[PDB]
Amino acid sequence: NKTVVVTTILESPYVMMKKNHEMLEGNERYEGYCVDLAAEIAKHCGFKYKLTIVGDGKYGARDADTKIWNGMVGELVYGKADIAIAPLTITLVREEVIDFSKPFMSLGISIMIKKGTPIESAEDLSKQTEIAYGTLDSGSTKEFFRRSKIAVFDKMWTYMRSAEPSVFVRTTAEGVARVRKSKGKYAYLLESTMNEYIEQRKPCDTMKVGGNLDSKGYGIATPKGSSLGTPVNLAVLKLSEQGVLDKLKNKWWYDKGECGA
């Protein structure tokens, strides 16, 4: 029995720095959905743990030249972290080199606009040029478009990969900031979960439009062959069944809404 190093990422409402964080030390610097979930998984698996923010601030992609994984995936892979507890999407390129528990939350790629933007769908975006759009770097959303064989999404990806200036953003906060400050002339593609939280946060100037483009989920990830893999997974199933996963969704989404009803 050894203290587990948890890799995670600063992403609202999953993991956020408390406002008085310079007061505080350790796990107490952080609050969020995945902070709460880590404390539940650690209880049901019987371990002690250290929350730690991914040094490079990325989710995880592999450089096509070096074949080096960055982000939280690379933290696991190179043995710097023992478990990743974060909105980290379950994908094939990833499930190869790490293990994922069953999905604790569902999401699909969605479109965020400034209120008033004449865009209702992904089709609407691919058929025009006035409103720019993009995704996050180093993540599952970017790769969905890169590797897509569907007509509209390949059209979107060819626009996106060569557009000037860049339509790609380093953090979600950056994509959101660009929607808000671009006067309706940028739309952001992000996961439905993140979009729905932000949609209900002041200044209440963004909106989610269109149906989800895919159906995926987030998993707890452990390095390939870890002894934490099976206990962690039974713990997700059990918290599902206890209603604890729904209760934490309500806490950090619905109860945090500032944009009316």
Ligand X SMILES: N[C@@H](CCC(=O)O)C(=O)O
Ligand Y SMILES: CC(C)S(=O)(=O)N[C@H]1Cc2ccc(Cn3cc(CO)c(C(F)(F)F)n3)cc2C1
Site for a copy of itself in 209-228 (CB under 8 A): 214-217
CB atoms within 10 A of CB 72: 28
Using CB under 6 A as the binding rule, whether residue 90 contacts ligand Y is answered as: yes
In this complex, which beta carbon is closest to ligand X, that of residue 141 or of residue 233? 141
Site for ligand X in 165-224 (CB under 6 A): 190-191
In this complex, which beta carbon is closest to ligand Y, that of residue 133 or of residue 153? 153
* Residue 136 touches which member of ligand Y, ligand X, a copy of itself, none, C-beta under 5-8 Å by kind: ligand X
In this complex, which beta carbon is closest to ligand X, that of residue 22 or of residue 241? 241
x/- mask, ligand Y, residues 204-243, rule CB under 6 A, reads -----------xxx------------------xx--x---
The CA distance from 9 to 28, in Å, is 15
Using CB under 6 A as the binding rule, whether residue 87 contacts ligand X is answered as: yes
In this complex, which beta carbon is closest to ligand Y, that of residue 178 or of residue 216? 216
Interface with a copy of itself (CB under 8 A), residue from 34, 90, 98, 125: 90
Stretch that binds ligand X, among 135-143, 149-157, 236-244, 246-254 (CB under 6 A): 135-143
Which residue's Cβ has the minimum distance to ligand X? 139
List contacts with ligand Y (CB under 6 A). 90, 102-104, 106, 215-217, 236-237, 240
- What residue ranges bind ligand X (CB under 6 A)? 59, 87-89, 136, 139-141, 190-191
